[PDB]
Protein: Glycylpeptide N-tetradecanoyltransferase 1
Organism: Homo sapiens
Amino acid sequence: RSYQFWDTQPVPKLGEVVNTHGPVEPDKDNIRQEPYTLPQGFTWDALDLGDRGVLKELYTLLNENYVEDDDNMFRFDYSPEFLLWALRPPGWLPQWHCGVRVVSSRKLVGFISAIPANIHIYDTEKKMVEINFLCVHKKLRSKRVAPVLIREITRRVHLEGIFQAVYTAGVVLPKPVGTCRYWHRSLNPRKLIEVKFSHLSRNMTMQRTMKLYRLPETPKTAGLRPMETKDIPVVHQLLTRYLKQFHLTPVMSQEEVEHWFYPQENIIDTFVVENANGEVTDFLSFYTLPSTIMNHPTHKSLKAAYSFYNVHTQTPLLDLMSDALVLAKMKGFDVFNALDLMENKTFLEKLKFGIGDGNLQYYLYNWKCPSMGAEKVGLVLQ
Ligand SMILES: CCCCCCCCCCCCCC(=O)SCCNC(=O)CCNC(=O)[C@H](O)C(C)(C)COP(=O)(O)OP(=O)(O)OC[C@H]1O[C@@H](n2cnc3c(N)ncnc32)[C@H](O)[C@@H]1OP(=O)(O)O
Ligand SMILES: Cc1nn(C)c(C)c1CCOc1cc(F)ccc1-c1ccc2n[nH]c(CN(C)C)c2c1
Ligand SMILES: [Mg+2]
């Protein structure tokens, strides 16, 4: 079609053949000082997420108005402490927690965020931001408020000297650098079929389906244990080495590996394999993100775990992923979710995952390069 806003932006056109690598336009050496204008009656407010009352306003905005699945049955329900993990990693800036309030009532009705990240894209490493948590209240939809939040976070990032971004979305925009399908692995099929996340096969009874997805009570790989503070350097080494094989990846410092992987109950889990010699040789990780089961009288919340970064050097990836499913089931999850990026297609079908119904598209702002297969994408955003 045409894209009234995105056709104005430094991104390649949909259908554009890209053979080159580099910025769409130059670094700016004068940047707009004034904020963009919202519609009348709304104002900007930078949200101090260290204030418990303001963090709870953001939690309510997203709980009521954030991403739903393609059937409008489940809505993400990020916890307040999860939002602090995703929004205050090393190098976060207060002006990059960008809220929109109704002037009279003060109600929070919009948000968008940026966090810094060093990104490796083919043969270039650049300091970028990751854009996430763009949300407009349901009563304000389709009034072109989202382009104002996108231009305003772009301005605030340009003031800090950054001219590229990475972001994901379930919608097609000019122009995906990679396209990933999500898959799911049932852990509690009775509840998944009750809430109609899943359906009972015409060729399987409930008994048989419970048996098909049943898992061992403890993981198979010897020496698996939670990551501890003494493991931060070796997790950093393992991840850095492992990610070199992909074409779009983060470059994390040792402090960022501590932030993104050190376990926090009900937010992030990381388990390392420590061999007979005391050496850590592998790790698996997954984050906790429930979904509200919209308008349902009985079960209110779907407990979902999401595959994060999984690094294998001595344990087969298939066994590490089996370990992850066992652990998730022990921790009371209903479903484990994963995308088809990195080496994930080597295990999805073998471990009984089923393919979902939509795409998570990956995008770069102000960076032209060839698109890549899902197997070459090595970056996961919450
Ligand atoms: C150098 C620094 C650069 C930094 C910035 C880099 C770019 C960052 C970009 C943002 C990365 C976000 C990453 C995440 O957080 S992905 C998660 C996005 N959030 C949700 O899906 C939550 C539920 N939905 C909503 O809250 C609203 O429907 C949103 C806010 C998504 C759109 O609000 P609304 O439905 O009321 O629409 P509008 O009338 O105001 O605006 C319509 C225009 O908006 C374009 N649109 C729709 N959805 C998206 C989307 N997910 N990314 C980018 N553009 C989007 C659309 O094609 C149209 O443009 P054009 O077709 O006319 O051209
Ligand atoms: C369950 C369920 N609850 N909901 C609300 C959806 C979209 C599902 C389907 C599974 O979706 C997934 C399953 C995966 F294994 C990985 C990712 C997603 C997914 C899909 C669309 C998204 N849009 N914004 C984000 C947030 N962030 C990455 C920018 C999304 C995350
Ligand atoms: Mg709008």
